Design a protein around this ligand. Structure first.
Ligand SMILES: NC(=O)c1ccc[n+]([C@@H]2O[C@H](COP(=O)([O-])OP(=O)(O)OC[C@H]3O[C@@H](n4cnc5c(N)ncnc54)[C@H](OP(=O)(O)O)[C@@H]3O)[C@@H](O)[C@H]2O)c1
Ligand SMILES: NC(=O)c1ccc[n+]([C@@H]2O[C@H](COP(=O)([O-])OP(=O)(O)OC[C@H]3O[C@@H](n4cnc5c(N)ncnc54)[C@H](OP(=O)(O)O)[C@@H]3O)[C@@H](O)[C@H]2O)c1
Ligand SMILES: NC(=O)c1ccc[n+]([C@@H]2O[C@H](COP(=O)([O-])OP(=O)(O)OC[C@H]3O[C@@H](n4cnc5c(N)ncnc54)[C@H](OP(=O)(O)O)[C@@H]3O)[C@@H](O)[C@H]2O)c1
Ligand SMILES: NC(=O)c1ccc[n+]([C@@H]2O[C@H](COP(=O)([O-])OP(=O)(O)OC[C@H]3O[C@@H](n4cnc5c(N)ncnc54)[C@H](OP(=O)(O)O)[C@@H]3O)[C@@H](O)[C@H]2O)c1
Ligand SMILES: CC1=Nc2c(N)nc(N)nc2NC1(C)C
Ligand SMILES: CC1=Nc2c(N)nc(N)nc2NC1(C)C
Ligand SMILES: CC1=Nc2c(N)nc(N)nc2NC1(C)C
Ligand SMILES: CC1=Nc2c(N)nc(N)nc2NC1(C)C
Lengths: 249, 243, 248, 248
């Protein structure tokens, strides 16, 4: 019988590509989503047509708050409700916007940027571990963590904490047979609304191909880390950036 | 006139050593504390006896919350109130206890560990910068890439603190504000003390609070005016020891 | 036409695992070896028995010297000689022994340890790129930052291999050549090592209290050479079962 | 008596600043140089004018070769023969020039770049330790080692190896009371170089949009050898004005 995976922020872009590739490998999937209800319902529908009852949706705000621990518990619970097991967790959902040091109040930005990128991944890891073969967690990190976007401190802080969690949980969940890893994109799928001239600026910086990663190319690294070809890999963060992080100012 | 420094969690231990050494260098100091009210007022008394009106205390909880941004703005305000300037911020205060993945609720654990180690440092950096040899020193951890078992939340916080150090160094550079870090390995029963001390290659002993303070003192000095975004490890070679 | 790979130090252990894996993926392989003549030809025969004209050996010392640049060019020329192409280079050959700060002369020790681990990979990368799904995989070390006591030269060589991996990824990207690394923690332990000492290194590993089979190392190599890694360059994948994460 | 220090490549620039500042702190100094004879002797005179018998020169090529171990041994010996002690070693000398992957032969380029940046520091460390207060070594590294200059593989390999040595010798010499540390400049004293190309690197630096003076680099070395660093070993301090933090 088929294994089961939870992907957070799976309605669009990289998340969707991961969910589709897991499903194409034979996984049953939980499509978590926040605002993108149409895209998530559509994806589940697409996957369920391919193979009956192998996909479900689950909505949750992953912003840090008093109810976040129960919300994360419920995301993991929904995988057990649907498929009776939870083998894989992909922490993909992420808030990304500038928070300059010099509409939203700063406490809200903290909650969103640190909640989505670090706290929720931790709380979901807790529930995954507590609710338990080839078990693994893959955390979507950032290849540019040590060369951050200007005025993106809280985002960068969340992504840094996520590296911390990847390492801490790898160590702690190793005795339980749970591997914990990361995939770190540099520049992948850029916003559709972003001018092509602006997209090009980031594209011209990538040594390998002068272009951004596809969502599928990121998913390819996730599939590897969850596979049997990685049964000894834990606490590792695989960069998928085409050399971007190696380019100086 | 004398420059002013804010040191969080400065009532005891490493924070006390940092406040004292900054004071001995000529800084007027704000001794932030949380629960150690007695020790902070005692330290403020000691420093003021040496030089009149060069030390004040400032109580604040640095657990994460919706009021934390205003608690951090007040700490900086308290430095301008007492001394009319704020040249140095030392982010020393830190919650440290295990949080295994498998009567403190997890929401509280997250609030205290991420709050003290990361979010409070961030908000203080904000208020510090907004109010302006200016520099910030963040007390990091030499063992962040080799963490204590079951310390995910503490380690997540210290990792974020690295992220802040580097992001704030880049962003506050055009303002002349340098942002740096000091990362202790083993610093401040007997058998467990002995166990950690034996692991340190250099002298098989822990760092004295003053040795850590020495690294803070270098980073705020004129001898470090081109240094920003650097984290100086003060660990006696501990991080270099394999399992 | 089937692609061709060069694997250095492929007569035994991890190198053989990588060579066999590539061959099973349909690669034609140059089995480079130093002393282990019998083992290399024995692997060559076994791979040729499965598919005709798909494996050859290549003897070469990779100790640092003035002739080493020529020796590296020849390893690469040898892949073109046999297969008319060279698509993949795996820098695996490695000297590993202590060199205490406080019997081989120190210049010999420098030549072998920096030679095999750093300079030879640099020279082979040179020759690989000159002679042109192209990629290079370098066998690194997960413990480069918590090194074995008294292994300064070996560690310096491994650190230099990281420098090379990143430098060459940057420089050979516009040419379509990807450069990546695989960093084992404890994998296949020395033949000379007794079972008591082996278990000591085994017990350090969080993930299964065991070393990586040569096959598990090769799996990481095969990923990086495959089309599943077309955007991955300058990446060093730890395959250490979380060993590097464990403090003293 | 006054402590003694060896500074390699001390005739001008950063090396000179370190020697001048160490001497200013109360150190007697061995000024090592390769080609800058007039500059080293000139510095020796200047420092000896300030305090009699506190400065000497020592000439050596630090290019890797069979005679390099003996060369490094004699550099350390020049400190003992003149001052009776050797308390500090600053590994500052360095070859730096492009070595593209695609009339100096490559074997020479390897010898010069890996020799000066990695192997000579290793052999000097060996000699320093074996010949043995406040004993420490400072290795001059590079803040941009993980975002290296294009076509500078050999130089970057050498600097990566120097990190390796700094960390390896830190662990191994810790029981002997010898501390091993690093100072990593970003853009410091140029080149000469085109002023247009100089200002291009300057504008990249977040802190001040300027390069570090040699004095500012020396400040970090002085800190590392000072009593204010008695617990610091295996640490590499960046003096880069934030340069290493700036994305492409
Ligand atoms: N794209 C890149 O170039 C790039 C570069 C570096 C790193 N990464 C990392 O790779 C991952 C995927 O990249 P991406 O660009 O595809 O991500 P993304 O579009 O920016 O975000 C992925 C999903 O996160 C969810 N999300 C945002 N805020 C949330 C909240 N408060 N609560 C619950 N969910 C929330 C959103 O779900 P809904 O749409 O349903 O609201 C969104 O679809 C991310 O973790 C990112 O940090 C990407
Ligand atoms: N000691 C080591 O071996 C070591 C190792 C690695 C890193 N570090 C780092 O170096 C720094 C100093 O070390 P340390 O051992 O001296 O630290 P510590 O004693 O454990 O904590 C220092 C101070 O933090 C304050 N604090 C705790 N929770 C707080 C809260 N919720 N709100 C406001 N303040 C709070 C406390 O203030 P009150 O007493 O007034 O309540 C305490 O005096 C810390 O950041 C630590 O993480 C230390
Ligand atoms: N095994 C581990 O636990 C571990 C840990 C960290 C890193 N690694 C890295 O992973 C790779 C594979 O490990 P391994 O244990 O399988 O390696 P290994 O057996 O120790 O070495 C592989 C081969 O290197 C060749 N070699 C040695 N000196 C040479 C020279 N001067 N010139 C040409 N070839 C020379 C030898 O070939 P001949 O026998 O034909 O003479 C040897 O068979 C190595 O690069 C190693 O450094 C391994
Ligand atoms: N300058 C920067 O922006 C920068 C940036 C990053 C790192 N660094 C590092 O900081 C240190 C000082 O920088 P720098 O710019 O002052 O260095 P540098 O001027 O380029 O070189 C310093 C000295 O190295 C000596 N040297 C070169 N080849 C030698 C050889 N084969 N044998 C013996 N000595 C040799 C030369 O001595 P002679 O003049 O007597 O021939 C030279 O004066 C270097 O290690 C450098 O790599 C500097
Ligand atoms: C370039 C980019 N990076 C992102 C990042 N780093 N993290 C998240 N969550 N989302 C991102 N989306 C875009 C804007 C496409
Ligand atoms: C022994 C020890 N004590 C610590 C302490 N007291 N406080 C912090 N923050 N971190 C510590 N880390 C170790 C090295 C595990
Ligand atoms: C026990 C051991 N053996 C090794 C070996 N045989 N070959 C290499 N290259 N590196 C090694 N390092 C460790 C994992 C410490
Ligand atoms: C930019 C530069 N970098 C150098 C470096 N990193 N190392 C050495 N030895 N020399 C250098 N010279 C100049 C041209 C000043």
């Amino acid at each position: 019988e088929a294994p089961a995976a939870v992907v957070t922020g799976a309605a669009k872009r990289i998340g969707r590509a991961i969910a589709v590739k897991l499903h194409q490998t034979g996984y049953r999937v939980v499509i978590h989503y926040h605002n993108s209800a149409e895209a998530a319902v559509s994806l589940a529908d697409e996957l369920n047509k391919e193979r009956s009852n192998t996909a479900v949706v689950c909505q949750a705000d992953l912003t840090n708050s008093n109810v976040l621990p129960a919300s994360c518990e419920e995301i993991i619970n929904s995988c057990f409700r649907a498929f009776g097991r939870c083998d894989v967790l992909v922490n993909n959902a992420s808030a990304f916007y500038p928070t300059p040091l010099v509409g939203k109040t700063v406490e809200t930005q903290v909650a969103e940027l640190i909640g989505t990128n670090a706290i929720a991944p931790f709380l979901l890891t807790m529930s995954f571990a507590q609710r338990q073969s080839n078990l693994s967690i893959v955390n979507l990190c950032d290849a540019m963590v040590d060369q951050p976007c200007m005025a993106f401190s809280l985002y960068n802080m969340g992504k840094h904490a996520l590296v911390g969690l990847t390492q801490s949980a790898a160590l702690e969940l190793a005795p339980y047979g749970i591997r914990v890893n990361g995939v770190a994109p540099g520049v992948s799928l850029l916003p559709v609304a972003m001018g092509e001239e602006e997209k090009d600026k980031w594209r011209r910086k990538v040594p390998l191909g002068r272009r951004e990663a596809s969502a599928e190319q990121i998913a390819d690294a996730v599939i590897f880390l969850v596979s049997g070809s990685a049964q000894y890999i834990t606490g590792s963060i695989i960069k998928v950036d085409g050399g971007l992080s190696l380019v100086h100012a």
